[PDB]
Amino acid sequence: SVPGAPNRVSFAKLREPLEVPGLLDVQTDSFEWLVGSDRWRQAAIDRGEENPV
Amino acid sequence: LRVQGPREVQIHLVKEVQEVYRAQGVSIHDKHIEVIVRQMLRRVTIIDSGSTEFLPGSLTERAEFEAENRRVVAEGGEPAAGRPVLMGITKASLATDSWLSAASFQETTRVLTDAAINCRSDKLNGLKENVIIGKLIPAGTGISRYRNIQVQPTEEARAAA
Amino acid sequence: MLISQRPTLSEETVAENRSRFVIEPLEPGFGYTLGNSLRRTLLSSIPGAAVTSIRIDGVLHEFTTVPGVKEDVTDIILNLKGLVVSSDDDEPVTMYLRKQGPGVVTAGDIVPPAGVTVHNPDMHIATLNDKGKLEVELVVERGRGYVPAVQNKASGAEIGRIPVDSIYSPVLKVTYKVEATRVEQRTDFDKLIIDVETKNSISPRDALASAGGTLVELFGLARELNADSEHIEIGPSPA
Amino acid sequence: MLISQRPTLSEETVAENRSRFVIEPLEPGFGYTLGNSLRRTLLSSIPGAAVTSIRIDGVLHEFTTVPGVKEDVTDIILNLKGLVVSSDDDEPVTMYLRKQGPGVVTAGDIVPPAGVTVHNPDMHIATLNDKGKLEVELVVERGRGYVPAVQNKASGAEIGRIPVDSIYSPVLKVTYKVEATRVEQRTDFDKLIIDVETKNSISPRDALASAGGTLVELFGLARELN
Amino acid sequence: LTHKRRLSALGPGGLSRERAGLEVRDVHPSHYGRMCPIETPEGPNIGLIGSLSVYARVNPFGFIETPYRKVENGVVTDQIDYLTADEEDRHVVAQANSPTDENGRFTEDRVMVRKKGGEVEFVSADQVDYMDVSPRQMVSVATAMIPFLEHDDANRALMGANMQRQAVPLVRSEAPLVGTGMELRAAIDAGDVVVADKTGVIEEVSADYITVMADDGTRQSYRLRKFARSNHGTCANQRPIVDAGQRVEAGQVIADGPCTQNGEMALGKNLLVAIMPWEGHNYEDAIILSNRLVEEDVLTSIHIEEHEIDARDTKLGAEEITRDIPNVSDEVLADLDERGIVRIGAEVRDGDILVGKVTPKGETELTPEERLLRAIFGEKAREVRDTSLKVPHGESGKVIGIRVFSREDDDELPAGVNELVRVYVAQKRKISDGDKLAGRHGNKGVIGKILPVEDMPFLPDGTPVDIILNTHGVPRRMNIGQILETHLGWVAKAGWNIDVAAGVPDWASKLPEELYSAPADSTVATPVFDGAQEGELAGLLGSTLPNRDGEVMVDADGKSTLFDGRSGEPFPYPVTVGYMYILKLHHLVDDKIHARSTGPYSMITQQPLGGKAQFGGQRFGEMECWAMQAYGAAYTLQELLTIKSDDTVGRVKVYEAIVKGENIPEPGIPESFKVLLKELQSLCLNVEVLS
Amino acid sequence: SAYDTPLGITNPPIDELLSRASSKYALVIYAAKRARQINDYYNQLGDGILEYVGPLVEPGLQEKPLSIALREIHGDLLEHTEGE
Amino acid sequence: QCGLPKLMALELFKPFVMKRLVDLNHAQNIKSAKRMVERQRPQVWDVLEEVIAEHPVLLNRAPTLHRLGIQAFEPQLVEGKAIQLHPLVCEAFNADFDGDQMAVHLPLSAEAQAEARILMLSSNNILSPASGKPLAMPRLDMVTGLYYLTTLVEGATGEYQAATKDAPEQGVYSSPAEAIMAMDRGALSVRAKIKVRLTELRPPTDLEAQLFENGWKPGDAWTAETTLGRVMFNELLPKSYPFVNEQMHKKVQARIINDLAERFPMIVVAQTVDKLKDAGFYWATRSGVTVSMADVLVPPQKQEILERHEAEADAIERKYQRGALNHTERNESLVKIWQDATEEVGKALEEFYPADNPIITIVKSGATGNLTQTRTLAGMKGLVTNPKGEFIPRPIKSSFREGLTVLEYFINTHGARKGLADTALRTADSGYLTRRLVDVSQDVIVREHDCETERGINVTLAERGPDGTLIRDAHVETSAFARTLATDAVDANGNVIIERGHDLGDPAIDALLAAGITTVKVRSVLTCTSATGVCAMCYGRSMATGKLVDIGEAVGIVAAQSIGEPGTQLTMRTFHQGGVTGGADI
Ligand SMILES: [Zn+2]
């Protein structure tokens, strides 16, 4: 999981297929789109967009 | 009320309200319901002025109607066309003679204009108007019967002092 | 290490055999410590004499009624349970109550042996009818506390011996409570109100003194472990 | 009949600071109340010594850090609260803790004056890097129970002193149980087994003796009726 | 963290706070996976404000979409796809807990799914189109921190979720013994911790900063904001949890924030709790606490407040801050510095001077009494009037920081302001009677009493319980999850060992291999909707390890015998005892106590003013007037409506009579009537009184 | 009848007092007027004006005038004429 | 009494404290005393403790739905920041100690202090003015205490054993003190049946006639077959009260308290309720009531009911597929089936739980809760409501003990959100009706003793019925009680029972029933002929005091408040703006 991750045995029986996404992504991605950051451009073009604005 | 006398309709209303409240587990004594209902049969509608000056179909206090039909009439208790009316909570509370209390929950301008044109005076008998004036309410300890109580020591006890 | 200030003990006499004691002001939290211990000591640490068994003449198997007396055997047992007896024997003794003819028979009719004293002669025992007779023997011995009926399950060689619960303790009913009080502008101190009812044998003051002495002797054992050690003292009241 | 054997007390050690005492025989229903009385006395009215206040060289209050120290002043105070000390004189006495350079600081490094002892030198206080220098003075005085900090507004101390809560109780844990003991002709009397674990300041038997003395003094009131 | 990811339904172009009743604030069947349907404010904004779910990201267009697992031919595959609500209405999605085969095929025939209308139905295994990513796909971050959430009622879950955001940071935090898997992530994503940027070795550690040397030779230095005031007054500070020479990987937490331990959120404390009524002191949701919590600072917190005052130019001159103050003794200002500001580190109570300040007065015109009085004393008139900043009533603490801005040094002060002074006062607030205290399952209560240690019931080994919760309040509120938390917390505190030597028991056949045995003080996780089953917890309760003496305190039923601390007799029946995680809310008594005798009065209405905790007055509504009239309490109503409000003439007479010992005079006529009379006369109405 | 000893502002019992007045309101006015008289007697004028006599019952250490008036009423040491 | 924080009391009483300080030479003048108080010097508290004595203070908890929301208490200084409130008055204030706050007001004038001391004192407001039913009575834990104390359980230690041949009676005690001694030794249980010779408790009427037909007095010993707990409970009641010997259910306690208020002075009632509170708390502390999942028992019959009703639902679905049902009727049939299933599961749970289980013991004793909540906790949640307001045909099988699944929890959240939104809008119409009622009845007051009217209304106390044995009418409590007879009760038995002007109380109604008279004429406010307002005789006794109403009583306000206070408890018209008009579905 994470580097530190203090040992905490879990009672879960199911398997997690998808890790929890960045909790603060809603507040950051919108602003990255507003200012057109380079990483935002890479993410948008990789999604299947051409000449994103 | 049309079929039977005024007493019967009051009993019917009390029974209906008490049944409504009791069917849901709420317990209230019948006397409170009776007190609430009594205010709905305090006015008598006057059809024609036979022993008064009240306009046709005008709501008048029962005591005033009785006094007018009893005393001022020279020929004795000449009847004046008038029958009891059931008029509900809203109109019963709205038909008060105290303009000071009426202006509390009615259009203030209309009430004030009607009072000024009529030049009628409000006697401070009640709770709504007295609190506005700052006078102590005419209920409980505030009535003249108890307010004017005079307290002095007994002659024997005073002598013992 | 000295206490904030010395507590005091006072008494008020509700009746001849009942009294209420007030101990205060105590350090906070000590009211509960003292109360239950004092109550238990008073109830179960004052030796006394009481009837531990009875035998009724003429009846040995049908313990419901006895001829010639208008009181059931249970009523006689309950009456005898209330007898006040003081003794210095340390050995069980036998007392006799014999009466014939109709009328009331009370405790005064008993004839105690040497060393046995009865404090409530007026206590009502039974009422005999015409031709009725009552011949009952009581076993009296000393003990502490309330000992339930010791049965004859393994001692069947004795016939007709009715065991009865014995209230050895001269103290009958004791209650206590703790109340909050303020001293030195702080409202944490405790006042202990202990109400004591006792038999006719001894006054409540003497019973309280005996309980206090017993508790002091008991805690002397703990004190003897290491004397001269740190311990909050109470100091003298007058000087 | 009424038994003649009066109660007696015996002791048995379990560890260096835990002892179990057996009192027997006792009247029925007497073990629990006596055990609870002893427990309350032990947990409430056993005197001891504790640190009342501290003064660090480079801080004016507790809401600040010391350069070169991993822990802040509040953490140092919290660690010091775990310190156990013994004192001989009622009046306050001063101890000094001084260290510099890299390394950890333990209660053992504290310098106690004559008549003052520290029983857990291995207790940790803080840790220092190369540019760290820790200097502090501690005031120790005797008392009982738990006493909160005393404000400098009333204590009259000058700015810089940091009062700390004092926990004078040396006892750590107490419990009791009751069993049935046999005396001639009966098998329903109470034997009380009470175990006491105390901090290293005093031995368990000393605490028990102190509690017994306090209880004797308190219960002498009833005996005074004569 | 919850605030940042919040979905508000109001503002510019939104809905009014007084509109849309029970029509837009209802839980639509489309919240599932895109908006938490349980956690929402209970205030005016119920339903209008919610929180985004754990697995949700906004579509570039602006439509909240959630992930789902692609299902083809009845086998679940790793082809996660993010769909919107309308995209989901054309498919049939199944639960995440539906059993599946090792390969991935469905083991059952009828599977529970959701239809296009938002209705739950049982369908064939082949009809399944998608599947949820995980059971906790509908709950938010705040709601996912509540263990055994499936056993709590919706209302109680909402209360607990909204209460978890009101926990004040404690002096020493501790992670919960029993929790979910959200404690870690929520701590790291909140940003209240310091995480190493790149792999390296800790160069040095101090209480103020951390230095780390990366594998590339690039140094990194992290400042640790220490004793920093939060917007709401709580102390926010960080302390390092690393030492020199420690290898640290990227993303590792090197420092922890206010409510984090080892990187996990630690909002509260684990306390030993016994479920039983106690002499009525915990009657009506009240809580009894042990004095130990006070002595050991278990529930202590740091509170910092800022007091600001400005000095500006005025038409009579420029008011200046000075140590010298007129008509005041020199003892009160003994703690002021050279420039007239309280020294840092000083202790201040109510009414203490923080910074001296004087203003030009102007016309004096002393009365003859004052003239003679100051002639005998000889103290000549002073042109200035004292206006120094004072500590508000009820507040105390120590000065921890002072900030000064001035136009003399080119600071950007507002127009006309010459200087500005801010003073920070910090205090060490311990737990006390009346402070609210609650768990994570909506169980809340004020602290009715704090007993001494010896009084609290104690276990046979001698451990005194830390808190007592009334039994009557649990079953009614329908929040049985707290009992499960208590049992599992006890199981975690004392390690457990299942008798797996002879074969896994029937109840333990489901436990993972790692969970068969754990040591004492272990921390376990019970994820929401995928946590420990009741049977497994019951089985574990019967396998707890002994204590130092070698005996088990809690039997197989989760109950233990407790001795009475006051009488000493053991309680007649065993009671439930365990460890519960409880947290201190910000609703403290010190901030919720008010009182008035005489103070400021309104300028227009001449009534006492309110809205502030210093000298705010209480409102006497019309319903209270009805109650007084029903009582027949004529005199009390008059005295309360005139003497104590907008009766300027009689108010001073009442004060004078009270101070002089004279009997109170009869009330006059309130201003509310004279003003009304004058106004109604102003409208050309000849209103007159007569006898 | 055989009630336990009242304490606080319950002494004397309200039921016994009520029997000595027309109603609760009359008793309230009775007590208030008597308390005003006691307070005026304490303050008086310095000249020893006897327009209002002092407490006919023995006062306590710091008993309020109202409590003294209620005790006097319970003791049948006063009389009043209703203002009807 | 009530506990008032030190700082709050000082702030409220500042001027009095300043006067006292100046009087005691602690301060030279007003300014010095003011400065001393504001600085809070040590001398202030000594003066405050004395000035506050015997000074009533009003406590209020808004909203004030009825006059009992404001009550006077005698304050006592307590350190802290929280006001200590008596546990009994909570129901009157409708407050719980989980964050609620109270407002404190201080009377100043002598009239106001007398008003608070007499009229508004809490000890004088035990009964509810609405109906006269006692309002300051044991609640929750207390009810669990007094109940547990008075329960009788077979097989208890020290149980009374009937005598046989060579076997006398065993469970017989000379006095309650001996029983206490035995219990302290573990030989007897507080709930075990025994025979005890009581000498200070008055025997019941039948036993008194059997044994003391000339009158019982203290010191007359009588043997009572009862439990030690019941004897201790009866020691709390006044010495003149007959022995009860019954299990103290909430209804039984209410009956006992109501009878006590009817016969004895109110002060005795206050003392008795204080004693009952103390005993209830003490015996609930050690009643063994606790919550654990070993105590939450799940009936074994639940699975069979669920399977059978699921089969019935499958049949309903099949018939719907056949076209014999439309959608709405299918949903209605499924809803009825599942409601029947829920009822059956609840009945099975009720018949499965042992009588001594804490969860069912709490509900059965009347302390709190209801069996529906127990079914939800251990049975099955049942049907839940969609946001539109209609029952979802598929119910929730899982119990909260088992743990609701994801979909069940999501569908359950709808009703929770709906109710939490509805709870506030519920009060709007109640307040509207209350303010109508008070406005119309604002100025109805009792102005004179009697109007001297011969009119009234006819009421019926009971009915003979088919068997001829008279059965009480369930409406007599709120109809005939608290009325004044218009005419003499001479219509039956050929002799008077009670003449005109007699107020019909519990003893009066009991005597009337024994006389075989059903119909009686009672004066009513409707038939009063007073010139203004109403008269005391027509109104009847005041439910708050239990005696004839006093002149000047504000009857109108009390009536309006009593009518309006329970308004929120009634069913109310739908709040859904969208949908269809709710008038038809009255
Ligand atoms: Zn009438």
Side-chain angles (χ1 to χ4, degrees), chain C residues 39 61 74 79 81 146 172, chain G residues 166 169 178 181 184 197:
Chain C
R39 177 177 174 284
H61 295 93
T74 317
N79 286 334
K81 278 183 175 191
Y146 166 91
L172 287 165
Chain G
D166 64 358
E169 293 83 3
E178 193 189 341
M181 271 185 228
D184 289 6
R197 214 164 160 203

Side-chain angles (χ1 to χ4, degrees), chain G residues 450-453 523-524 528-530 534-535 537-538:
Chain G
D450 191 352
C451 61
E452 301 282 3
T453 187
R523 307 177 69 161
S524 167
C528 189
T529 58
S530 185
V534 300
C535 79
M537 296 300 302
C538 282

